[PDB]
Amino acid sequence: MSSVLKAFERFTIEQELQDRGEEGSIPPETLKSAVKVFVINTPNPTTRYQMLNFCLRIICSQNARASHRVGALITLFSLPSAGMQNHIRLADRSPEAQIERCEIDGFEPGTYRLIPNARANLTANEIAAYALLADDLPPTINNGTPYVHADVEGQPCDEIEQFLDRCYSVLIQAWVMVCKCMTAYDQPAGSADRRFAKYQQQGRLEARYMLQPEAQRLIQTAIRKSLVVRQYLTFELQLARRQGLLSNRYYAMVGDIGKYIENSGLTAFFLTLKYALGTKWSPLSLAAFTGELTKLRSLMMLYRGLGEQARYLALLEAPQIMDFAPGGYPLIFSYAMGVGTVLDVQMRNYTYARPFLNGYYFQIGVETARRQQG
Amino acid sequence: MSSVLKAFERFTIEQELQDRGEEGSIPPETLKSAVKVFVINTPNPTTRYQMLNFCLRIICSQNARASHRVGALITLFSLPSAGMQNHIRLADRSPEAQIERCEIDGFEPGTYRLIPNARANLTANEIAAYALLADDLPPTINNGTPYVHADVEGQPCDEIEQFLDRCYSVLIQAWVMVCKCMTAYDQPAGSADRRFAKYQQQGRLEARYMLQPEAQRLIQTAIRKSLVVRQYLTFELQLARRQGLLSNRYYAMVGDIGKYIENSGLTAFFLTLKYALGTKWSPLSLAAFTGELTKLRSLMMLYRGLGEQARYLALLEAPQIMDFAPGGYPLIFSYAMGVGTVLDVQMRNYTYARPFLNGYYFQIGVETARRQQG
RNA sequence: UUUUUU
RNA sequence: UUUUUU
RNA sequence: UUUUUU
Numbered sequence: 001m002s003s004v005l006k007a008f009e010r011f012t013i014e015q016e017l018q019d020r021g022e023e024g025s026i027p028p029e030t031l032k033s034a035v036k037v038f039v040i041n042t043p044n045p046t047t048r049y050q051m052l053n054f055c056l057r058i059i060c061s062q063n064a065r066a067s068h069r070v071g072a073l074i075t076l077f078s079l080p081s082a083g084m085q086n087h088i089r090l091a092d093r094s095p096e097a098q099i100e101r102c103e104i105d106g107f108e109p110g111t112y113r114l115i116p117n118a119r120a121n122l123t124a125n126e127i128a129a130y131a132l133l134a135d136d137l138p139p140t141i142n143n144g145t146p147y148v149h150a151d152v153e154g155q156p157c158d159e160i161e162q163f164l165d166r167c168y169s170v171l172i173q174a175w176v177m178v179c180k181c182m183t184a185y186d187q188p189a190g191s192a193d194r195r196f197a198k199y200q201q202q203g204r205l206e207a208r209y210m211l212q213p214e215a216q217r218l219i220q221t222a223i224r225k226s227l228v229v230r231q232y233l234t235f236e237l238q239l240a241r242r243q244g245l246l247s248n249r250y251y252a253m254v255g256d257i258g259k260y261i262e263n264s265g266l267t268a269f270f271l272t273l274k275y276a277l278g279t280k281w282s283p284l285s286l287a288a289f290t291g292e293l294t295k296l297r298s299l300m301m302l303y304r305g306l307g308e309q310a311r312y313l314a315l316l317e318a319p320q321i322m323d324f325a326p327g328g329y330p331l332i333f334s335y336a337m338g339v340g341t342v343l344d345v346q347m348r349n350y351t352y353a354r355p356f357l358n359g360y361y362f363q364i365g366v367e368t369a370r371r372q373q374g
Numbered sequence: 375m376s377s378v379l380k381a382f383e384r385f386t387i388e389q390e391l392q393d394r395g396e397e398g399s400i401p402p403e404t405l406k407s408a409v410k411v412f413v414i415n416t417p418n419p420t421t422r423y424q425m426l427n428f429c430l431r432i433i434c435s436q437n438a439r440a441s442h443r444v445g446a447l448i449t450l451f452s453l454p455s456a457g458m459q460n461h462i463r464l465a466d467r468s469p470e471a472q473i474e475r476c477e478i479d480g481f482e483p484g485t486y487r488l489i490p491n492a493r494a495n496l497t498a499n500e501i502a503a504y505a506l507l508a509d510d511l512p513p514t515i516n517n518g519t520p521y522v523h524a525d526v527e528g529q530p531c532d533e534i535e536q537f538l539d540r541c542y543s544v545l546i547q548a549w550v551m552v553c554k555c556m557t558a559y560d561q562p563a564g565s566a567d568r569r570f571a572k573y574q575q576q577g578r579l580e581a582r583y584m585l586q587p588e589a590q591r592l593i594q595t596a597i598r599k600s601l602v603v604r605q606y607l608t609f610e611l612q613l614a615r616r617q618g619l620l621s622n623r624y625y626a627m628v629g630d631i632g633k634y635i636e637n638s639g640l641t642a643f644f645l646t647l648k649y650a651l652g653t654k655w656s657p658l659s660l661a662a663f664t665g666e667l668t669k670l671r672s673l674m675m676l677y678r679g680l681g682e683q684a685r686y687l688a689l690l691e692a693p694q695i696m697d698f699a700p701g702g703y704p705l706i707f708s709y710a711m712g713v714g715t716v717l718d719v720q721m722r723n724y725t726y727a728r729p730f731l732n733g734y735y736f737q738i739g740v741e742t743a744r745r746q747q748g
Numbered sequence: 749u750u751u752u753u754u
Numbered sequence: 755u756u757u758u759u760u
Numbered sequence: 761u762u763u764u765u766u
Contacts, residue, residue: 043405045405048405080402080404080405081402081403081404082403082404082405082406083403087402159407159439159441160405160406160407160408161407161439161440161441163405164404164405164407167405180757182755182756183756183757184756184757185756187757191758191759191760194759194760194761195760195761197761198760198761198762199761201761201762202691202761202762203598203599236402239401239402240401240693241393241395241693242395242396242399243395243399243400243401244395244396244397244398244399244681244692245680245681245683245686245690245692245694246401246467246468246469246605246683246690247401247469247692247693248401248402248404248406248469248470249404249470249601250401250402250404251401251402251404252601252691252692252693254693255692255693255694256691256693256696256761258693259693259696259697259760260696260760265755265756265757267756267757267758267759268756268757271758273382273665274665277378277379277382277665278382278663278664278665278666279662279663279665280661280662280663280664281662283375283378283379287375290375293375293378294378296378296382297377297378297381297382300381300382300385301381303385303389304385304388304389308392314755314756317755321755322754322755325754325755326754327753327754328754330753330754340758343705343732344704344730344732344758344759345758346729346730346758346759347758347759348758349757349758349759350757350758350759351756351757351758352757352758355753355754356753356754372662373734554763556761556762557762557763558762558763559762561763565764565765565766568765568766569766572766633766634766639761639762639763641762641763641764641765642762642763645764688761688762691761695761696760696761699760699761700760701759701760702760704759704760714764718764718765719764720764720765721764721765722764723763723764723765724763724764724765725762725763725764726763726764729759729760730759730760
């Protein structure tokens with residue numbers, strides 16, 4: 001019959017799209033750890049280099065609380081700001097944060113101790129705790145500094161332009177690790193290898209401030225296992241896609257790597273799109289099977305409806321990412337892999353063997369490709 | 375099925391075009407090095423020749439700060455201005471700059487020292503620093519001067535018209551190096567060879583003021599690794615495409631070389647356009663594969679939407695350049711190369727062998743071409 | 749009534 | 755749940 | 761990421 005099929009499609013579409021909710025939903029007000037973020041009123045470049053080393057060590061430290069690592073990351077990714085108050089008021093949106101502003105006047109010389117402002121609210125004890133924290137690197141980190149070349153922490157900085165080189169090499173390493181932070185981990189990544197090669201050859205990444213592979217993996221894990229940091233990263237990426245061609249050097253790098261971050265972890269979805277709705281002959285083989293096809297169509301409507309942040313799924317780990325799973329269309333997925341295994345050799349390195357991979361439809365993908373070619 | 379394919383196309387288009395943001399986006403206010411640019415109130419041609427040699431040496435110097443090289447380049451490319459204040463207020467737009475105007479009254483005779491104005495704010499110490507900086511050429515630069523013929527720095531200039539010849543030969547060499555500054559480097563470039571031959575034979579380039587190959591490579595690198603300079607270059611090119619046929623000699627040369635600068639580094643994109651959407655028979659072979667085709671169509675919409683500056687991608691290194699990468703359509707790219715390898719012998723010198731180059735589709739390009747011909 | 753998979 | 759490439 | 765030609 002026919003009208004049954006039409007009602008079937010309309011039902012699929014509605015049941016998928018109904019998970020939209022309201023965009024301005026203020027979720028339940030849960031427990032939120034108090035975070036202390038460091039703000040520097042006037043642009044003291046030596047203070048900022050000190051703070052960058054401070055926070056990189058905090059994050060690299062092992063005996064640090066999660067709120068400590070979060071204050072560290074939110075201060076670190078917010079150092080290039082001119083007026084840092086109104087740039088931390090950007091993370092202020094995030095519901096899972098109750099940050100308090102720490103008005104830093106400087107560092108006690110030669111040591112990691114802090115020098116608070118007058119209006120700021122700080123006691124010496126927490127300062128000493130921070131100090132004893134800021135020097136606790138794991139034993140695998142060689143030479144007691146996160147960088148590969150130990151002298152870098154010792155290099156003095158009083159000119160804004162050198163601090164900018166240092167800060168930006170640091171942050172580009174950070175974002176490059178964020179790229180595969182939720183997906184590929186505990187593994188030396190050829191992908192991050194190549195992204196680092198590219199950003200060196202582009203002169204944005206300076207081997208003068210390269211970080212050791214283990215410190216890279218460490219900051220990757222440390223940013224993954226926090227959330228307010230990733231909400232702030234998404235705030236930043238959505239600012240960096242809002243600027244025109246005229247931009248800072250920072251936001252430019254931000255967007256350049258965001259072009260790699262976006263659409264993270266939805267690989268099976270997009271590969272199915274590519275090797276079934278891209279190759280003009282897939283319904284030529286899978287024409288009977290409209291369930292998966294309307295499934296995918298619903299998924300695309302959902303994607304576009306989700307908003308601009310739809311690309312930051314695996315980053316924000318919002319619930320919706322479960323939808324696009326390849327379980328919702330295993331036959332078309334098996335065919336898409338059976339195609340990609342011959343229309344690409346690079347894809348043969350994908351974890352495409354799934355529990356629900358149809359063997360015969362993968363075989364049909366293979367044979368269709370080999371007939372297209374042979 | 376069909377409606378799946380239609381939704382697929384619409385989704386591709388939207389996901390590509392949504393990266394537009396807002397044209398007037400004022401990015402995050404990051405750290406910006408203070409730049410001192412030299413302004414000459416009244417048209418003193420001897421002062422301007424002195425300043426041109428001053429800045430060319432500064433840029434060629436090795437022990438100079440980045441803010442120094444930036445002040446140098448922004449003064450150099452802004453010497454032909456009549457009222458230099460309101461021509462530096464053009465670079466004033468750029469967010470990554472906080473330039474301060476240096477009201478120069480002249481040079482102390484026989485030396486590189488500067489003579490400030492009354493209202494200007496300058497101390498002797500920075501003047502001496504500038505002086506000791508302005509004479510620090512690398513050892514590979516022969517004869518202690520950037521030019522090939524040493525006497526040129528010694529040639530006195532009091533008449534505007536000679537200063538103009540010198541200045542403009544300098545600047546045309548600069549722009550010719552800018553042409554392949556982000557793309558092809560650390561290599562003697564036959565392209566810059568031919569552009570220099572052309573601009574000599576056109577009488578715009580004067581072998582009297584030719585610069586040595588190594589000094590060329592040096593200024594190329596020095597302009598690449600700065601950004602505010604490239605934002606100012608783009609300001610200039612967008613002024614030079616706004617004048618009619620009636621123009622100065624300067625802006626005319628500017629635009630003439632901009633016709634080579636524009637659409638920089640997007641070569642794979644345009645070659646795919648040329649050898650797949652140019653040759654009227656490519657869908658004749660690749661008709662099934664509509665994914666890449668709608669991909670390209672989205673790319674073109676994005677290009678046109680980006681604005682007039684869309685041609686200055688690799689120059690401005692704005693984030694968007696990542697989009698047009700040949701990774702987003704490897705099969706059509708392999709076919710386009712398999713075609714261009716027979717419909718052109720010049721293209722055989724392109725770095726077309728990519729990791730994701732399909733061998734069989736390159737082979738199909740080759741065979742289709744050889745059947746068209748044979 | 750329920751019962752596989754994600 | 756994730757996993758190739760840019 | 762880039763890479764031929766004008």
